[PDB]
Amino acid sequence: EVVLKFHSFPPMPANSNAKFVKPWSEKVLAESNGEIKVEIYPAMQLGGKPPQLVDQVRDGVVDIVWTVAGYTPGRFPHLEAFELPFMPASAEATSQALQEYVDTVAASDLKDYKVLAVFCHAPGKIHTKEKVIASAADLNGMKMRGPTRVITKMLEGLGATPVGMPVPAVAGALSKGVIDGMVVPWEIMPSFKLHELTAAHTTVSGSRGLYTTPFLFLMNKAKYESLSDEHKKVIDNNAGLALAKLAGQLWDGFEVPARKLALDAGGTIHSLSGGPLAEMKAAGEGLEADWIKSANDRGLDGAMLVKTAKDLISKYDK
Numbered sequence: 393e394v395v396l397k398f399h400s401f402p403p404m405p406a407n408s409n410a411k412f413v414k415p416w417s418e419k420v421l422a423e424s425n426g427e428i429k430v431e432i433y434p435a436m437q438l439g440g441k442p443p444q445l446v447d448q449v450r451d452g453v454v455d456i457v458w459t460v461a462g463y464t465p466g467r468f469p470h471l472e473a474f475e476l477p478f479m480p481a482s483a484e485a486t487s488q489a490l491q492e493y494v495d496t497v498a499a500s501d502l503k504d505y506k507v508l509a510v511f512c513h514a515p516g517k518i519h520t521k522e523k524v525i526a527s528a529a530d531l532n533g534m535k536m537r538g539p540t541r542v543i544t545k546m547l548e549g550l551g552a553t554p555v556g557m558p559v560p561a562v563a564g565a566l567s568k569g570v571i572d573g574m575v576v577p578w579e580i581m582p583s584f585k586l587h588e589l590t591a592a593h594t595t596v597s598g599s600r601g602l603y604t605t606p607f608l609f610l611m612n613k614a615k616y617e618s619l620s621d622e623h624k625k626v627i628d629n630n631a632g633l634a635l636a637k638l639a640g641q642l643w644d645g646f647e648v649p650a651r652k653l654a655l656d657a658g659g660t661i662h663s664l665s666g667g668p669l670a671e672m673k674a675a676g677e678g679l680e681a682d683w684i685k686s687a688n689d690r691g692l693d694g695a696m697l698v699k700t701a702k703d704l705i706s707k708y709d710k
């Protein structure tokens with residue numbers, strides 16, 4: 393028998409716990425004949441703040457985490473390419489691209505970990521208390537939260553006043569008036585009542601959404617290596633590209649009931665197209681160039697990685 397401590401930051405009802413890690417842990421339990429017992433500790437119930445999850449799992453404080461790579465800026469630099477404006481397709485396609493990326497050119501970012509899967513959410517949307525965002529001009533004077541440095545840089549480039557924080561902090565920041573809105577996918581909003589604190593929502597039309605941010609589903613490497621071969625087989629049956637694809641599918645589905653809750657809460661939904669959308673995509677091109685420059689300075693082939701991300705997403709967007 394083997395107990396594995398799972399740690400993450402969203403509360404237990406959030407989809408990442410209730411509809412991803414919980415059923416994952418049930419599959420692992422059953423397929424190991426009852427021997428691998430994953431204990432789920434949501435809401436940072438084992439101590440620390442969300443950026444510390446990667447340290448905890450790297451160093452063996454806990455055995456498994458689910459987290460957002462960019463909550464620790466610069467720590468997973470290859471994955472930043474997938475955060476660039478108008479990079480993502482569905483979460484299903486983009487998650488498969490992310491996992492193949494990590495399996496190949498981006499492997500050094502995660503060499504200190506056992507990768508269960510790297511995946512992402514459906515492209516995020518723009519949420520504000522009251523102001524409809526119909527063009528970049530509407531972001532002027534709006535204090536807008538993003539989840540990572542790359543996404544706050546996007547918000548800067550679109551004309552907003554950028555603020556960063558992990559998602560559990562967003563509701564309190566809205567309540568106190570220190571932000572006017574945020575970017576998130578739909579699916580995370582009900583877990584923090586974010587759809588009751590914002591009434592205006594903007595999405596984008598076409599084949600690529602505004603942005604996504606990579607999630608990390610990681611196991612302590614030493615702990616994985618210490619497992620018996622039969623236990624490793626169970627974990628690996630529940631890992632890799634097939635898991636990244638499954639996670640992406642699930643995250644695409646998670647948007648649907650959450651969007652409905654936002655509409656039932658009185659929200660507007662505006663879809664950018666035409667000129668207003670093209671203006672944002674043009675700003676996105678400049679932000680790609682900014683990122684390539686930052687990647688080059690850090691010893692990465694920024695241009696190669698951006699093209700790789702695009703080509704992998706195209707590969708799986710079928």
Ligand SMILES: O=C(O)Cc1cccc(O)c1
Nearest residue numbers: 513539558559576577580
């Ligand atoms: O902080 C974020 O915006 C990223 C995030 C965090 C948790 C669930 C999500 O869908 C997305």
